[PDB]
Symmetry: C3
Subunit: 393 residues, 3 copies
Amino acid sequence: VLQKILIGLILGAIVGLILGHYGYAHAVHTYVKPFGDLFVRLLKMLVMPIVFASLVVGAASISPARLGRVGVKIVVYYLLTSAFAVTLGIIMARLFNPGAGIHLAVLVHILLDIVPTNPFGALANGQVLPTIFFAIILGIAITYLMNSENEKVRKSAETLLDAINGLAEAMYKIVNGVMQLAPIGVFALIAYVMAEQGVHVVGELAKVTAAVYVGLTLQILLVYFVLLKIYGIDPISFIKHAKDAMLTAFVTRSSSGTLPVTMRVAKEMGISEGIYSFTLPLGATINMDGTALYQGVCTFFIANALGSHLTVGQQLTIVLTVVLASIGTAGVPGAGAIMLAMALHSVGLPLTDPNVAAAYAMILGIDAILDMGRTMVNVTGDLTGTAIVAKTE
Amino acid sequence: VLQKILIGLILGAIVGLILGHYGYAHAVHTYVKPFGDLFVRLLKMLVMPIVFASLVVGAASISPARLGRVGVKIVVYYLLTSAFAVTLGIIMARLFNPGAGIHLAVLVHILLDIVPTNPFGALANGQVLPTIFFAIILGIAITYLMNSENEKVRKSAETLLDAINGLAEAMYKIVNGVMQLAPIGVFALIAYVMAEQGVHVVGELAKVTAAVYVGLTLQILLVYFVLLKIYGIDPISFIKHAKDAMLTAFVTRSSSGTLPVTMRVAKEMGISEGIYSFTLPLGATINMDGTALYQGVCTFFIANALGSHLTVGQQLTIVLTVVLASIGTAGVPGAGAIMLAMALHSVGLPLTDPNVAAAYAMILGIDAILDMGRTMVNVTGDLTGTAIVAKTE
Amino acid sequence: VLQKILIGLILGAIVGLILGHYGYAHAVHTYVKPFGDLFVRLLKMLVMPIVFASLVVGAASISPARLGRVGVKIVVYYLLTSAFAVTLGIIMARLFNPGAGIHLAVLVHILLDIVPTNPFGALANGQVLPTIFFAIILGIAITYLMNSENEKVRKSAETLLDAINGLAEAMYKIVNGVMQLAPIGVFALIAYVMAEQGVHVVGELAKVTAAVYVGLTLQILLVYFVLLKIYGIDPISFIKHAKDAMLTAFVTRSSSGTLPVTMRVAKEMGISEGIYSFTLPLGATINMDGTALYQGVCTFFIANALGSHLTVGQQLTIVLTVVLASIGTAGVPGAGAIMLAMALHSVGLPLTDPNVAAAYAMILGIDAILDMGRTMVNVTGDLTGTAIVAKTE
Ligand SMILES: N[C@@H](CC(=O)O)C(=O)O
Ligand SMILES: N[C@@H](CC(=O)O)C(=O)O
Ligand SMILES: N[C@@H](CC(=O)O)C(=O)O
Ligand code: NA
Ligand code: NA
Ligand code: NA
Ligand code: NA
Ligand code: NA
Ligand code: NA
Ligand code: NA
Ligand code: NA
Ligand code: NA
């Protein structure tokens, strides 16, 4: 576990890069990738039940006044960590210089959709945010039945809450059983990514790869570790517990698919179920510091590859636009590169221009490698804020 | 509540009509309507769970012989109240004269679809009638397990019925919490309708508007109040309890979306859960006296605007066709005007004729204002029949 | 029951064939078929709940070591019975000679899809195999909570398992109530098939009809009865208990739709719920001996009608291809004839050839009559293997 997952990650990238330099990326896509795809299928299987069941129980166990206080805390935390990741990525884009080696030249509906019109349908087809909304309303209604003067109502409410909790506790036991297959699933996914896109990390694409990974490492040290030290949390013991969720996120490149592993990690470190069952699923789609840092670095790569000087006001409007795009990015692999296109239409750089689509295509050739570092930071920011908010209730 | 909802309804129509005469209907569509749309999203959220859970519990608590007796009673009640609404609308269409001011000239698959082939899918995508069918079969099966000679079967059946009831009782507590936002949601929806279509109530369109609302008022007095007095039910105390569901139906213009408010109203007035949990959801799609009265008035408006004399046999075939269209009309806003087109193909007036589509378009310009009075009578007829059937078990 | 279903089957085929020789097949499609379609709607209604609920309970009651042993047993049984059905059909195709009277001339994605990415969605839209996968994982997780050192976890796990079992036991009581309508539903479906396709059983099509039904009768005697005698099971008492599921399968021509009747039959004969709740739903899509025997007979009919000699190596590759097509065939009516086209592309006989499509069309004219005998053997093979595996745990 603590060694076999690291073994599969290291040995898989070695087997991936070796088989990638030869050109057998089509061979690992046939015989190796299905073992990693299966590992993701199992984790995606548990997302909707483990989110809905844990939140009905958690929103009941906690008081609505405290639950709303956690939302105000975790949202202010999410907006600040993402805004810091962009300004850290822009700084990392200027410490390095990606784009100088190549010489080219040139809402209300979303809020209302949080409220589902059919929670049975919401559970049926993904939709974590509508599920989060209905599960909170349900759990809060459950405990208002606990205070009923009627005996039949209290027994029926306790029965439903227990059955729901029985489902929740069941899903967590499945994660511990699925994570036994992680060394094989980790080995397979890291090898497929390193085989297909490991050859593409050359030259200016190797610069933007190092500019992002250094920014992500600095995001963990200068932001997450510092904030954990300020709120009195040992970072080394935190990474030891989050090691399973961080590597699973780095490997599956899906914050939504890693979500059952992160909620187990938060449970395994004693965080109240009324907090992590609400911040982790909401943070799996809103808190994306790794995506916010990646989109800030690449927007500078586009502007530098095209020989355009970005004013301080333009660098400022990039931060506000990337944070908006950081939230709109899905917790699925490759979503950040698609959302990067919307951040380029705001600075007046359309993808219809051939030189814009050229550099954008270059990023796609290494997007999955950058996607690994993105999701791990998108997920760590969810656990870091959950632990800090739970530290202050 | 008893005042704030009336305040939001009155003040909203005032703010709506004032902002409508200026032309700021696009402004209330942007800043005001989302507050009313959100109120409808919350009510639609509770429909499927509150229908399925309450009916499994209600069909278990009641005996199958009594449940089938309620169906025969409530269906005979539904067909008579709708047939009376059309003949009342045709009479109201002749007391007034809409169409003289403008001078122009010229099944088995549905029954089988009540039985769902996947109750999990039925719950996922609307389909109240298939849910009603499965919930009745489930609740009846639950109580047949209560009489099992086995102890494990009785405990497991009581466990499921309690958990289901825990969900039901939970949804009702949500309605009381959502109705706290009704004064804002009522104010928003009445203002958007009065701003967009309040300017259109001029001339012959003001005649058909008064001809319908008088017929709906007469439907409540001469039919509902009389039948409540015959079966020994004080109408004033009935309207006091149904005030929340009647105004919510008048404002949301959706019998299906108002359904969680009407089932709470029926619970708040002591009606057995084995009755209202079956008649109200079935009446939200079959009992539409307000729609049956509206389609009878408008069919005369089409024939009078085109200068065509309707024989007594034609007026008779209109009633039989509108009642058929009254049942096929959905409990969603604007469904009655779409179903009005099918009632015109039967009398030999196709919408391909330009003069037919002209008067039909005129009705669309005031359809939402008429839709408010429709749904309130469609819903009142559900509560009136439920209370009368519960008065006789 | 034991007589009325046989009465409706016999009298329905008589009324079907009589009304079919006149030509009133359109009359029985209008007034008779809806009564049979309704009977299938009710059975399809119970499939998903009775599969999911019974398997969570069954996989919990049984040990995972024994459950995996049943899978290895029932799969080896399924592959052998299907391979024997093809070799029996090819032998039956050579005892008779269909095609001499007419003189003409001329995977990994499937495995990964067993693991659902949303069990709520899987239940919503069919997908028995993903449900089987999640229900087993859930039931196994339930009993791992029974051994928890925590009291709240054991109570919540027992609560969920009971509620789920309460649903399961409920669905079985519905089957016994739906089967009371079987004599009407059986009479209707047998009459519609005999009216539409009874006229088509003439000449060479009557030969292939007798060649299949004799092979299916020999499949029950020489394979099922022999294996039941070897494992010490009285065949006469077995057919008496399976009479309801065998005739329902013969009449509805849907192994998936008959599944709630077969699981009840297996319960009514004392088979452990940890076995039949896993082998019967898995066998309703994988074990299709009647389809495997039908596709073997028809492939010879195509080759004989086109005057092509089939080598022993070709007859061998037909068996391996039909068994592959036997598994891919759905448990819905007419699926075997569609899957027969894929078995013809392997032997190098495309349906683009006019003479190939001619004989293929002839089989479609009698496909539903052959589909009756298919499903009954597809279902009997599920019960036969379940009883034999349960005989040895
Ligand atoms: N891989 C990221 C999304 C992205 O950056 O494309 C996540 O799942 O959070
Ligand atoms: N508004 C009506 C339908 C209609 O008349 O269009 C209802 O919801 O019942
Ligand atoms: N009727 C078969 C399928 C087929 O052979 O077409 C079944 O349901 O198992
Ligand atoms: Na963030
Ligand atoms: Na995230
Ligand atoms: Na995001
Ligand atoms: Na009615
Ligand atoms: Na209604
Ligand atoms: Na209707
Ligand atoms: Na088989
Ligand atoms: Na089968
Ligand atoms: Na099959």
